[PDB]
Amino acid sequence: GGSPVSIKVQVPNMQDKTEWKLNGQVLVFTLPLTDQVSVIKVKIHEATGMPAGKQKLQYEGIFIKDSNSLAYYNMANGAVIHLALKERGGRKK
């Protein structure tokens, strides 16, 4: 199946919001391509203290889901997941 690969997280630029440390940085980790992107959200919560319940997943500018896996988005060693603040229910276009 999917092997472990390096995945980065392009954190948002929000260092003055509350208590976390979001400064546009990248957080790298190693996870199997079969691990749903939802794993990444946890990795930021350790690297910044921001809970996964309020994070937006993106890969190369593509809004990915937490239920999708890295293999589904063709991600591999050196991939970059842009994190954004998302705490609201959103809205129609």
In the block, which residue shows the tokens 């991600």?
Answer: 75
Distance CA 18, CA 86 (A): 14
Residue spans per domain, the chain = 1-93
Start-to-end CA distance of the chain, whole Å, equals 38
Q: Is the dihedral of CA 37, 43, 48, 53 positive or negative?
A: positive
Please give the method by which this entry was determined: NMR
What is the rounded distance in angstroms from the CA atom of residue 80 to the CA atom of residue 9? 5
Q: Are 55 and 20 in contact (CB under 8 A)?
A: no
Tell me, letter by letter, the H, E, C secondary structure of the chain. CCCEEEEEEECCCCCCCCCCCCCCCECCEEEECCCECHHHHHHHHHHCCCCHHHEEEEECCECCCCCCECCCCCCCCCEEEEEEECCCCCCCC
| CA–CA separation, 64 and 70 (whole Å) | 9
Q: Are 37 and 57 in contact (CB under 8 A)?
A: yes
Q: How far is residue 86's CA from residue 50's CA, in Å, rounded to a whole number?
A: 11
Spatial contact of 62 and 73, defined as CB atoms under 8 Å apart = yes
